[PDB]
Amino acid sequence: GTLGINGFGRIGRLVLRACMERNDITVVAINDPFMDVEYMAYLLKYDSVHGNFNGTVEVSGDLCINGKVVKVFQAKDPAEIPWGASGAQIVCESTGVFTTEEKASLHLKGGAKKVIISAPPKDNVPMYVMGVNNTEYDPSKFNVISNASCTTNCLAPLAKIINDKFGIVEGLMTTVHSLTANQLTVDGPSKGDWRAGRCAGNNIIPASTGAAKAVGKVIPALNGKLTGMAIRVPTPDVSVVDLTCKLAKPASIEEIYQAVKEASNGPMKGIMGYTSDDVVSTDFIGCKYSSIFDKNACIALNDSFVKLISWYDNESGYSNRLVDLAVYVASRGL
Numbered sequence: 030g031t032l033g034i035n036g037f038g039r040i041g042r043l044v045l046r047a048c049m050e051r052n053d054i055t056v057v058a059i060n061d062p063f064m065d066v067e068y069m070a071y072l073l074k075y076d077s078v079h080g081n082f083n084g085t086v087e088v089s090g091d092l093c094i095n096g097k098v099v100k101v102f103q104a105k106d107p108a109e110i111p112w113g114a115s116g117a118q119i120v121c122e123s124t125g126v127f128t129t130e131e132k133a134s135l136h137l138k139g140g141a142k143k144v145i146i147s148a149p150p151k152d153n154v155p156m157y158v159m160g161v162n163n164t165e166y167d168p169s170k171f172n173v174i175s176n177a178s179c180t181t182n183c184l185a186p187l188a189k190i191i192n193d194k195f196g197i198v199e200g201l202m203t204t205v206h207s208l209t210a211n212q213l214t215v216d217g218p219s220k221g222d223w224r225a226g227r228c229a230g231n232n233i234i235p236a237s238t239g240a241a242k243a244v245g246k247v248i249p250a251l252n253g254k255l256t257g258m259a260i261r262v263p264t265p266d267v268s269v270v271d272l273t274c275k276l277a278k279p280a281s282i283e284e285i286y287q288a289v290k291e292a293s294n295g296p297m298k299g300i301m302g303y304t305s306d307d308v309v310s311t312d313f314i315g316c317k318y319s320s321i322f323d324k325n326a327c328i329a330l331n332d333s334f335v336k337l338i339s340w341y342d343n344e345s346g347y348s349n350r351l352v353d354l355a356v357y358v359a360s361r362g363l
């Protein structure tokens with residue numbers, strides 16, 4: 030099982046870091062036109078959130094990472110990356126700019142077998158969330174797939190647990206989200222979300238997100254039952270889902286906590302997690318879970334109307350899931 034990374038940004042780099050921990054997948058090639066091999070090595074080695082790389086990085090051609098050659102490309106066009114020549118079977122598409130089947134499928138010209146878009150698609154490319162719907166993937170039906178967003182990977186396991194046990198009548202989500210690369214250090218033009226181009230470090234910034242409605246595709250039972258928005262805040266990493274939902278059957282916070290705990294310790298092992306501790310966002314830097322239920326941050330109006338809080342490391346948790354999905358895709362054939 031081999032991986033090619035297109036876009037060696039926050040996600041692309043953390044995807045590589047994930048694989049280096051992993052014994053069943055190897056990164057064999059990187060493409061990023063906006064960084065030469067020297068710059069690539071540096072951005073791998075040093076991370077403002079996730080620390081010094083654990084292991085070795087040197088420049089050869091190409092990178093030498095933990096003693097193994099990783100082929101390096103700088104092409105604008107995905108059609109042009111020789112994935113097949115490099116021996117790269119799966120492409121992690123993490124540029125943020127090729128989020129359709131049309132665009133992402135061009136990786137197949139270079140001889141890749143499969144492509145995982147590291148974002149929700151602008152089209153109807155199927156979205157998979159590990160531990161929720163990933164086994165619905167049929168290798169004979171799709172070559173380009175999406176891993177959804179960080180926010181969807183946080184909400185979907187939570188939604189599934191809550192829907193299955195109690196039934197969600199209606200739900201509205203806010204995600205309070207750490208800043209990302211699309212934001213700006215000072216007020217300037219976006220490309221060109223006017224709010225997102227306001228000085229990122231001193232603002233609370235409302236944003237649109239499709240994450241909650243996306244849960245309605247991932248879990249078709251919840252189609253039309255969920256929507257949401259995001260609030261961007263100055264912190265460098267880690268985000269939180271605030272889910273306000275009406276339930277079809279009564280449930281106390283305690284009963285919801287047990288349903289979470291059941292799934293965390295069984296079917297959603299490693300995907301859903303939980304805590305009753307006085308946690309804050311930085312406590313989840315490096316967390317590999319998709320969704321961490323915060324018991325003591327939740328509040329109920331009554332037995333039917335509830336506000337649930339779940340954490341996610343939007344960089345690290347999502348990147349692990351993308352690696353999980355790639356390992357899953359490989360095990361299914363091609």
Ligand SMILES: NC(=O)c1ccc[n+]([C@@H]2O[C@H](COP(=O)([O-])OP(=O)(O)OC[C@H]3O[C@@H](n4cnc5c(N)ncnc54)[C@H](O)[C@@H]3O)[C@@H](O)[C@H]2O)c1
Pocket residue numbers: 035036037038039040041060061062063064104105106123124125126147148177178179180209210211343344347
């Ligand atoms: N960072 C997060 O919290 C997060 C979480 C989940 C999903 N995502 C999604 O993952 C994708 C990337 O996110 P990010 O935060 O890493 O962004 P980023 O800006 O850090 O990374 C994007 C990388 O792609 C490179 N790139 C641009 N054009 C390219 C091209 N034509 N060919 C190859 N590489 C190119 C850029 O140089 C950059 O290194 C986006 O779809 C984003 O929405 C981000």
